[PDB]
């Protein structure tokens, strides 16, 4: 078989992803890969790459056989000494906090709750837990953490509803009640929230808007067309839309710009200083590429 | 604060009878009370079975089948009514009630859920056959979680997640055809799912076979032959969808508005407009929840004209 990427990630001049191939069973590997440079790293059985801002440090998840647990660990990347931190029944999330020095953990250890762990790297220990309902997520807001959780009703309902919380230190105060979208993103000022407008629920497509404590702004309003992943970085939006047959990639700076766009899709994208995404095309299966203004393949995994 | 209204949901109809959940904050008790009301189309007249949803009419009208909450229990009971003998009774017990779906027999129902210890719409998956004939439970096996089933004439046909372990994000089932404690499997590793049958032709939901799939759910039927997709080359998302006599009925998603179409070969409009359709029903009639930016949703039928059932909300403006 071929070289299945997923989960590409980038902060620096690093960039990593997760390698999957088949011996037995099939396997995942972390492979983490410097640009101006382009040696290859490898942890072995480890997926949700996640790299410090600052490019300290790796975080990422092991799956574990016999005991059935999700494992998370922390590793120095220059001395690479790694140690599991955490184990939970499933884990749904995996973010640094912008001081490269806290982690959130999402996961599983009416009915089940959503684990919310932060993990700190000087203490070296995990420093602080909450739980939410069931489909709660979260996100990092510089270090308050913004939080989803479903819209609880007794009337019965058609929609699915969303209420929204901003978190602090055992803390909160509700952003949105019954909302039709939840927060995907956080630049520590503009919150990214990805669904549809309040009172058109019934819309036809998940869009962008960006919340800053004053007015929520649609970035996609008069383009008949839905959002598949999106990240916010500096005020700027980087989002992929489905487009008839295709999945394209694009920036918002206030003027919405391509950044790839073409017969192909991009199946997963991440951006620090430069723009990284994985793209597949009819005939070849999903490759790394770069983008500084210009594109650039990383990997040729399946040649052929 | 506000609440003065009546919200109606689960339209549902069999023969000349239509019925629905009517949810109505009482004044009394300080809290929400849901109401099943069935009403006969020929003269207008009502019956009422309270603290109840889910409203499922037996194919020839003598039953109904319904959900009630037990709320220091913490279970959902399943509940037949015998709309002749005017006798209901809880038939069984369960954490949580996923689908609630009677035969063509009008005597077996089936029944998918969470065993009790000890897409809009209104650690296994439990599926129970219960008979009223003998008033037992004569079937039940065990799905891995979020499996789901429908009736294909005497058969249950099985969805269940693949979950395979190649790890991914393009959702996969394999559906399997169940009987008498034996299945055999029908698709493997599909992106649809079976959503409902006429006894011939089975309806399928999800995303086309092959790279291409993305942004919306599409319908598909399954006759013995070929897995056929009837709108691929329309873009535009799928709420609903129900199979009658080999037509489809079904909502798409357009333009901020939720329209009701037919499709036998070709697509016509039901209920098309600037509203939202909440949810439908089709037997000999068509049924359905209408929604406007000025109108909470009420009771529509359809048989070629549209006609208004109900005005809870503007009783004295609606009905001139």
């Known amino acids: ?30 492979v983490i890969e410097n640009l101006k440079n382009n040696a290859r790293r490898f942890i072995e059985n480890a997926t949700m790459p996640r790299i410090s801002p600052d490019g300290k440090k790796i975080a990422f998840m092991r799956a574990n056989e016999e005991k059935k647990v999700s494992e998370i660990w922390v590793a120095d990347l220059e001395t690479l000494s790694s140690k599991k931190i955490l184990e939970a029944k499933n884990i749904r999330s995996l973010e640094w906090n912008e001081d490269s020095r806290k982690l959130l953990i999402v996961g599983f250890k009416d009915g089940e709750k959503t684990t919310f762990w932060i993990f700190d790297t000087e203490s070296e220990e995990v420093i602080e837990e909450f739980e939410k309902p069931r489909f709660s997520s979260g996100i990092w807001h510089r270090d308050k953490i913004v939080v989803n959780v479903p ?8 929609f699915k509803f969303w209420d929204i919380y901003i978190w602090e230190d055992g803390k909160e105060e509700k952003m949105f009640e019954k909302v039709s979208f939840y927060a995907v993103d956080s630049d520590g000022e503009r919150i990214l929230l990805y669904g549809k407008p309040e009172k058109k629920y019934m819309s036809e497509h998940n869009k962008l808007y960006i919340y ?9 309003d008069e383009v008949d067309r839905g959002v598949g992943q999106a990240k916010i970085k500096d005020g700027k939006v980087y989002f992929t839309l489905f487009e008839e047959g295709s999945v394209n990639l694009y920036i918002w700076d206030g003027e919405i710009k391509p950044i790839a766009k ?10 620090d200083e430069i723009v990284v995404y994985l793209k597949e095309t009819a005939t070849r299966l999903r490759e790394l590429f770069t983008w500084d203004g210009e594109e650039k393949q990383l990997t040729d995994y399946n040649d052929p």
């Open 262 to 271: 073409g017969r192909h899709w991009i199946m997963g994208f991440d951006v």
């Open 212 to 220: 800053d404590g004053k007015e929520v702004m649609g970035i996609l």
């Open 151 to 158: 819209h609880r009703e007794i009337i019965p309902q058609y």
């Open 1 to 30: 078989k071929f070289a299945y990427l997923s989960d590409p990630r980038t902060k620096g001049e690093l960039v990593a992803y997760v390698l999957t191939k088949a011996d037995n069973k099939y396997e995942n590997t972390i």
